Structures are given as C-alpha cells and as structure tokens.
Amino acid sequence: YSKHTPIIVREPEDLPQGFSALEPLVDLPIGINITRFQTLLALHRSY
Amino acid sequence: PTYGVGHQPYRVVVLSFELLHAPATVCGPKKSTNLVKNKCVNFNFNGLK
Numbered sequence: 489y490s491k492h493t494p495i496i497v498r499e500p501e502d503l504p505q506g507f508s509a510l511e512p513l514v515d516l517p518i519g520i521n522i523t524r525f526q527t528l529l530a531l532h533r534s535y
Numbered sequence: 536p537t538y539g540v541g542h543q544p545y546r547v548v549v550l551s552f553e554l555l556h557a558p559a560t561v562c563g564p565k566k567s568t569n570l571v572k573n574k575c576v577n578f579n580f581n582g583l584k
C-alpha cells in the first residue's frame with residue numbers, strides 16, 4: 489500500500505497531523521517465510 | 536526398423552502431482568459462457584454466486 493502528500497515545512501520532529509487513506513497497489517502470491525526486515529540506501533561516493 | 540513392436544522405442548513422459556502448504560498456482564483453466572441481461576439467471580461471477 490502507498491500514498492504521497494507534501495508538507496512544505498520540514499520540521500523534522502514528528503509526522504504531520506492529518507488523516508490519509510492508504511490505497512492498495514499490488515498483491516503478491518508467494519507464501520515464503522518472513523521474520524526479519526532490512527532496508528537499503530542510495531550512496532554512490534563522496535560528492 | 537526391422538525389429539518388432541516389442542523391441543521398438545517408446546517415448547515416456549511421467550507427471551508427478553504434489554500438494555504442499557502453497558496457495559495453489561499451477562492448476563487448470565476455467566471456461567466462460569456468454570453474458571445475458573434482463574433475464575432471471577443464476578450466475579457464478581469469479582466465485583460469487
């Protein structure tokens with residue numbers, strides 16, 4: 489599920505005070521075991 | 536070619552079905568009929584009846 493909204497002001501303190509409905513985008517039929525989560529970042533070089 | 540049917544070569548293909556905890560993926564086709572309107576008809580639309 490995913491959505492996007494703008495905020496203009498950064499204020500890196502807390503999530504915005506607002507309601508939003510999360511619309512589905514895709515469904516996946518493989519039923520493999522999942523127990524842990526890991527994420528990536530885009531870092532190319534010092535620049 | 537000169538050998539008999541008993542000694543002739545035969546091509547054999549073996550299929551092996553199995554069931555697991557998977558959500559079922561590889562099964563066969565479902566056929567559909569025409570669509571009728573304005574008549575009292577029992578229907579089966581993709582599992583809803």
Ligand SMILES: *[C@@H]1O[C@H](CO)[C@@H](O)[C@H](O)[C@H]1NC(C)=O
Pocket residue numbers: 521522523
């Ligand atoms: C993970 O796989 C094992 C099989 O060793 C199974 O017993 C278990 O239900 C699966 N799921 C989780 C969340 O452990």
